[PDB]
């Protein structure tokens, strides 16, 4: 889950869960996912409270209850939000089909609300983190996050000045939640492809024109994916996203070949013909070997 998917879960929660009281709570017995608190303490703390709004920063979601502490959800690689109870919904990835077990055996956070509405956070891989904090934004991990790619976009000049001091290849920088928050593997590939920047290009080597192009592509990719509530089927056809998952040799975009470069455990789908690595030979070499650090 990257910013768009987590944001869609946030809006799905606000569609029917606001202003409703928590009548029953089930916090999973997972001392790996449920962090820093026992499930029974977690349950006792939020039972009886009303959900005022749903908030998000990067890939972290949290519920603003009528009074704190507030439950927060760090999605990890398989975290998901599911809402059952209201037949009609604008958020399909959060709907639950009758043939699905419910509550899911993967549920980590579950509450039954007024009007029989039930909300659940599930994690099949157990890489997610669920916390109950006095203020989610004051402590880790949310307090260590860089500005939200959607809610706090840097200006063109702020963006350029920050990149000038970053001495690392751009792909991993974009993934660093402490620099900018919310970008994951596919958004990174998409904005780099769109801006015509190679994943091994050092951020500090980017020219003023490159920074602006990247600034523009981050804006367009994030705004569009959110505009369509993370429904990839609605992603513009000219995005590398669609063929980014196809087997090597048969992956193309707008008719051009897609290759897959893997540096330091990170794989990037890019178009060699359109994304060139720039700079002196020894700097390009240092970037290709950067993973050694």
From Swiss-Prot:
What cellular component terms from Gene Ontology apply here? nucleus
Q: List UniProt keywords, sorted A-Z.
A: DNA damage, DNA repair, DNA-binding, Glycosidase, Hydrolase, Lyase, Multifunctional enzyme, Nucleus
Q: Give the catalytic activity.
A: Hydrolysis of DNA containing ring-opened 7-methylguanine residues, releasing 2,6-diamino-4-hydroxy-5-(N-methyl)formamidopyrimidine; 2'-deoxyribonucleotide-(2'-deoxyribose 5'-phosphate)-2'-deoxyribonucleotide-DNA = a 3'-end 2'-deoxyribonucleotide-(2,3-dehydro-2,3-deoxyribose 5'-phosphate)-DNA + a 5'-end 5'-phospho-2'-deoxyribonucleoside-DNA + H(+)
> What is one process in the GO biological process aspect for this record?
DNA repair
Which residues are annotated as active site?
A: 1 (schiff-base intermediate with dna), 2 (proton donor), 59 (proton donor)
Which domain of life does the UniProt lineage start with?
A: Eukaryota
Q: What happens when the gene is disrupted?
A: No visible phenotype under normal growth conditions or UV-A irradiation stress.
In the record, the note on similarity to other proteins reads: Belongs to the FPG family.
According to the record's subunit comment, the protein's assembly and interactions are: Monomer.
- Role noted for this protein: Involved in base excision repair of DNA damaged by oxidation or by mutagenic agents. Acts as a DNA glycosylase that recognizes and removes damaged bases. Can process efficiently 4,6-diamino-5-formamidopyrimidine (FapyA), 2,6-diamino-4- hydroxy-5-formamidopyrimidine (FapyG) and the further oxidation products of 8-oxoguanine (8-oxoG), such as guanidinohydantoin and spiroiminodihydantoin. Has marginal activity towards 8-oxoG. Has AP (apurinic/apyrimidinic) lyase activity.
Name of this protein: Formamidopyrimidine-DNA glycosylase
Query: What is the organism field in this record?
Result: Arabidopsis thaliana (Mouse-ear cress)
Instruction: Identify the gene encoding this protein.
Output: FPG1
Instruction: State the covered range within the intact protein.
Output: 2 to 281 of 390
């Amino acid at each position: 889950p990257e910013l768009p998917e987590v944001e869609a879960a946030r809006r799905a929660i606000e569609e029917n869960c606001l202003g409703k009281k928590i009548k029953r709570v089930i916090i999973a017995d997972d001392n790996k996912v449920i962090h820093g608190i026992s499930p029974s303490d977690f349950q006792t703390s939020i039972l009886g409270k009303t959900i005022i709004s749903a908030r998000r920063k990067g890939k972290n979601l949290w519920l603003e209850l009528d009074s704190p502490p507030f439950p927060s959800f760090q999605f990890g690689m398989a975290g998901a939000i599911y809402i059952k109870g209201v037949a009609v919904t604008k958020y399909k990835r959060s709907a639950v089909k009758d043939s699905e077990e419910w509550p899911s055996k993967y549920s980590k956070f579950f509450v039954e609300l007024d009007d029989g509405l039930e909300l659940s956070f599930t994690d099949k891989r157990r890489f997610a983190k669920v916390r109950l904090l006095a203020n989610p934004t004051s402590v880790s991990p949310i307090s260590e996050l860089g500005p939200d790619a959607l809610l706090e976009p840097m200006t063109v000049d702020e963006f350029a000045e920050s990149l000038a001091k970053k001495k690392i290849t751009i792909k991993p920088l974009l993934l660093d939640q402490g620099y900018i928050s919310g970008i994951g593997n596919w958004i990174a590939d998409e904005v780099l492809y769109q801006a015509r920047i190679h994943p091994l290009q050092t951020a500090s080597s980017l020219s003023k024109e490159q920074c602006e192009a990247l600034h523009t592509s981050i804006k367009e990719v994030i705004e569009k994916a959110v505009e369509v509530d993370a429904d990839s089927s609605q992603f513009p056809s000219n995005w590398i996203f669609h063929n980014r998952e196809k087997k090597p040799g048969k992956a193309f975009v707008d008719g051009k070949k897609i290759d897959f470069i893997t540096a330091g455990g990170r794989t990037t789908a890019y178009v060699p013909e359109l994304q060139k690595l720039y700079g002196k030979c020894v700097d390009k070499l240092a970037a290709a070997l950067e993973h050694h650090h």
